[PDB]
Symmetry: D2
Subunit: 388 residues, 4 copies
Amino acid sequence: MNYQPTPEDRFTFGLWTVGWQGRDPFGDATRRALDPVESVQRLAELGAHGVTFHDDDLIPFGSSDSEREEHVKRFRQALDDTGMKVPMATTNLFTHPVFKDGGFTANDRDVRRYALRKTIRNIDLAVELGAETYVAWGGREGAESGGAKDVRDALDRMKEAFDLLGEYVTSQGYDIRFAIEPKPNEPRGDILLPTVGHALAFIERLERPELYGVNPEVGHEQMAGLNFPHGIAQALWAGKLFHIDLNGQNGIKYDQDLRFGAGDLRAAFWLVDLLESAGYSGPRHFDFKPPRTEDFDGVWASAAGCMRNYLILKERAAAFRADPEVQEALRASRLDELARPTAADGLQALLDDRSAFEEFDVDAAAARGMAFERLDQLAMDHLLGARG
Amino acid sequence: MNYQPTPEDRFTFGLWTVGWQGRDPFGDATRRALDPVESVQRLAELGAHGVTFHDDDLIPFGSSDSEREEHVKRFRQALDDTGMKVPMATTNLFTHPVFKDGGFTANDRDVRRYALRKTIRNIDLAVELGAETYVAWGGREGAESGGAKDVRDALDRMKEAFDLLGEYVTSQGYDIRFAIEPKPNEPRGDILLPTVGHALAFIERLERPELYGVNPEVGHEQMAGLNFPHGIAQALWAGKLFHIDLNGQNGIKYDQDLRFGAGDLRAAFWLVDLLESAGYSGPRHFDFKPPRTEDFDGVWASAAGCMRNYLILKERAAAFRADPEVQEALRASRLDELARPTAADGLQALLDDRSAFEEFDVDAAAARGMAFERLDQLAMDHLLGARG
Amino acid sequence: MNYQPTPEDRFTFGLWTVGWQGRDPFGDATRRALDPVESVQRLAELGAHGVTFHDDDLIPFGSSDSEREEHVKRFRQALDDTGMKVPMATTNLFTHPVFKDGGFTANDRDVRRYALRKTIRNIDLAVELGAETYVAWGGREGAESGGAKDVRDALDRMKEAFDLLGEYVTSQGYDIRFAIEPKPNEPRGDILLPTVGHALAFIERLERPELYGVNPEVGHEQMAGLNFPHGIAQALWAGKLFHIDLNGQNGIKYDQDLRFGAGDLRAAFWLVDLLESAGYSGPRHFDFKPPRTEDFDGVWASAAGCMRNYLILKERAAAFRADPEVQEALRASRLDELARPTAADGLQALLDDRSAFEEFDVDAAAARGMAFERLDQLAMDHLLGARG
Amino acid sequence: MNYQPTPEDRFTFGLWTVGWQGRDPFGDATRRALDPVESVQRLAELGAHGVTFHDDDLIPFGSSDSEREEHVKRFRQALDDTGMKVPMATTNLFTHPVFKDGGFTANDRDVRRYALRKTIRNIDLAVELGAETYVAWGGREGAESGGAKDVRDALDRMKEAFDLLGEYVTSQGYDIRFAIEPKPNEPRGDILLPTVGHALAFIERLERPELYGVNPEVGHEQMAGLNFPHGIAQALWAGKLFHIDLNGQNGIKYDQDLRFGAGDLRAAFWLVDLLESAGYSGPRHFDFKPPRTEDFDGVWASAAGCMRNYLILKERAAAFRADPEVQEALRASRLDELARPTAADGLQALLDDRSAFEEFDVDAAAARGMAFERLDQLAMDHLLGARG
Ligand SMILES: [Mn+2]
Ligand SMILES: [Mn+2]
Ligand SMILES: [Mn+2]
Ligand SMILES: [Mn+2]
Ligand SMILES: [Mn+2]
Ligand SMILES: [Mn+2]
Ligand SMILES: [Mn+2]
Ligand SMILES: [Mn+2]
């Protein structure tokens, strides 16, 4: 009763995840930097399908064109050697001091034009390496004080930057879509588009909305105390779950990026249940940081536990939905009735229906129990493997 | 140096606000019920412009048609006597036990049809009394456990109910628009459409999106730790701020509904600055509860402090934006540059501009300070009336 | 592979838990009131050991001496019939409007004297029924605004009330100890002694500290975002864990009181691991509310799941600590070294030890990994029953 | 109407505060390092009274004895030149990788002995420079996972380290006291002694409790959603407010360390009201970080706003307590009755008093309003300078 990942499970990892050296706001690095080639080989041995990158994880900031080509060649050799793919890439618009007030929404116009040129150069690289999704996390777009950022003008600037990127990709004929990753705060006091709902709403004002979706991350929505599986259900309902970032978080505090399955384990169960029952077919990407207490052995153990925990939860949620006694409890709780139209008969028929109002017996309907606690204990027994 | 409201300030109050008897999850009522006629007269004496109501605040649940007409007649007499208006109404789909699993998204189909008929009966009344906005707060739409609610089917049911309401109003030719009020939790474990962003995104999937906007409430977004003025800026940017609920909240905990100005006072300052500078012209509505420690004297003192605090903050934010030394600091922090297009020259010109990349001096741009702390201390001095 | 409680597991329930009628801040009761005699019989059938009560759960507020004796006689008959015990009692100083500003710390002195007399009358009853612990939850002690409560004077009044109660019990020669139950907010804006640490610190200023300990509740510490097992470890370290309240809570929001095992399931695992490894031998008491969606069938299913989840976690934490491969990982992570004195050699020897400073190789010590992630994945595999 | 600090106001700053180069978890430094001598001179020009330091802020980690003496000599010259004092010092047991699992509670015993020797070397320096308080913030004492730290053994190790430090100071005859600074999380997942209450309770188990108090920080208690003025009132009630750290924080999220007065401004008002009315006479120390958006001009503007905001709030809270109309409202709300003993007549007299129970009219007492909202609006008008 083992749970071994293969490339067919579509597990992916950022270079910056196993590569995090452990520098935190209060402490120096505890690990040496990893060569991207080494992380590719190590992850392929553990059963991953592919890796993702920011521009600056792969090519050191400020590299000449000659060093650039060399970093890319070595990387491409390691992907050829291992069969690893690169399904997603993104841009670092947060580390360099120039980005201290943002990239696409910095108050200085010159910085905003630089942020767009740095982005477009990386879209060409991403296409060259086969990525299908290009993520944008605007971690420096926001403010610590109320007068520093007029948010209407900042959303104008954010729409303008995403529209120009959509013009670029369509003009080049690339097959690449964008995914915005929300985060509510950190490193800015408040970050713009702080949740999946704010990012979905913003996309509907872009010139070509069909090019853009969301890349929600488990820990980010939980930094606002929100239910992550409910936000993913809304992104699926809108047709905008382009990619997802999996990790764990213990409640409302700094962004911990623990391995997937740590943090809120029942939310991890209900998230896997939803991804597998809606048939999400994108990458299962981990954006996590092995804690700085760990050496290299602890890094690969942490990355392997990400994939393990996903496959254990997958088996438990599939056993839950397959159990006849659960199917009976779902009917007892009227989940089948939730899926039927309230008024397929139409408005006039509803208005004329005396059984919907004038003769509706509210006390009898109120007295019906929902039987949700028995259903939730079945879900608990299935998660813990304690079926009796 | 007084700050007296008049009807022209457009301050409104729910009947349920000054009428809250003080029953909480742990305690009995501490005040007797108020007759709606008395609250109308008392609020008109304090300088309010109007009141709002749920159906069940005005006509006791289960009233016969004859009692209904009588409750309405007395109410209409008090509005005629005082000149008070009723700009907004809404439906109680949360108190009666029948709504224990929701109104529009209850699993039982019969309850969902009842919720729509109860709503439509109140839209006709609202129109009769002159309301222009009809609010929906779906406080029972959500779940305490993951299997009890499939959120995709529940958003289908929520879209179906709002589409049927938009069919009804258009068929009747009423001039009324809808405003959804988000809340992240309480009384359900998690509530659907938990923030302003989730409600904005959902509206874009309705059949006639132009009929629906948001009614955000200060304390609700702060129950998710979000910046309320930034969420209102996004609702204004989308053209969807139809109405607003003003109150105060001390951080992430139960929904306190304190009088406006209590809670986070700097967020109250930046919210008034934004409403008055964007020229919001809807009602300034208070959805608050005078604490149960208070008698009737303390109720009207609390309601008067709502309006007072709004007018004090209005004066301080207008003095802030009018101060030449603030206008100079805003330029020093490049707020004027945030309002200019990043690339009105277009994409090709940006790609060809060597000053945006190849010759952009990143170190010189990085070294420029943003001067945000001096700007924020000017904002502080203006709020506290300590201009030196 | 079943997990059936018996009276020997020491599971207890408040009358107010299965008896909660489901009134919330936004809704009417969804269930009829239960006779205490019926809850005693139903809980004894499910395998509980005993029940607890507030004065007002057992004898309706304002009952005459004659009705009092009658309510007590019927209750005592049901305990005799079932073998159920009553290990803990407490006082309702929160529901009646007189307590709207507190019991022991109300600003009105007359209310404070009434709160003490109401308490002492219930201590005599509790002793008569065999309780060994008397809990105090001061849910109305606190404030919504800063000027309403001088907290130094309020802690003087709180010390005075607890000192008088300790005088009473010692004068009567009763064998009863007190346990203060902290809660950070709700129903007051902020409650005094808001966490286990604040209650432990306060006890050390009472006249006879040995009579008082804490009754921490899982959901209350998590309403402040704190780690519940770490607060219980501190209460055990101080010798003050007199009683405990078990339930579940999803993060920082209103007090949900879900059944035990819901909420944060990994914290439930580590709490059971600690209670069983420290040999806590008090009652395992559930202070929970079956959700108002449920009928009576759902009430008893919820109460049975409390006990079930405890016994499943007990088995998983005992398998974890018994696994040789876990014992090896604990040594690999130096848990054995944490239990040894840092300097049993004494201060002078430490100062003279060159290996502690002058010749301590900091780089070699820094490079040692802690191997915490492999240990935590073993803990995960044990919780999920996925040992491979 | 200006508010200029002088050395007599006792404002102090850490070297690490104005010296923060702006490295965050996501970004490089935006400012060059400041020489301690320069910060001393700049702060003395702004009106500060003194500075504080960690060992490693003053003498670079690993410095030889010769470089040590030189760094100290230059520093002492700048204090002589400016008249600045050094009232508090502390140890860095968090930055170097050796401390990745803690200092006093690291699992490795060798690291724990090193942490104590590094501490004692800095106590001698602190005494030499005249500090009266030595702070300990154990930012690395805690865990990200439940098996990594047995908290009972870790509190044994923490008691042992503080007892050895108290032995050292008493053996040397130094006049220095210790202050523990709590923080609930960050950089560890959970930090031990996470709040002021947990630190107060822990001190009562040390061998010589009179040597130890707390150094609470505004933003840290608010990272747990707690009321900072109420925690300081409890520390004052216990006689343990040895020092305090002033700053601002916007709710439950990463530790922002904004300048004092930012964040929750009404809590800043009530904190100043309490410090000045209880006559706290220690340093008013700022532990803040000028945001990384700022250049050097913005650093000194931020530090000056710390002191400004304190003096504005001091004037407003003194005008509040001096206003006869406020004194009347405090009596109307029975604050005078809160300060009188509930039962100076003693227990037997209370038991015999029929007016406390048998003849107490609960309805009349319940009907009395507390008049808290009128009092809180007076407090609001005083804070905003809007007295009418
Ligand atoms: Mn993250
Ligand atoms: Mn991510
Ligand atoms: Mn509210
Ligand atoms: Mn509202
Ligand atoms: Mn509770
Ligand atoms: Mn409890
Ligand atoms: Mn801090
Ligand atoms: Mn500090």
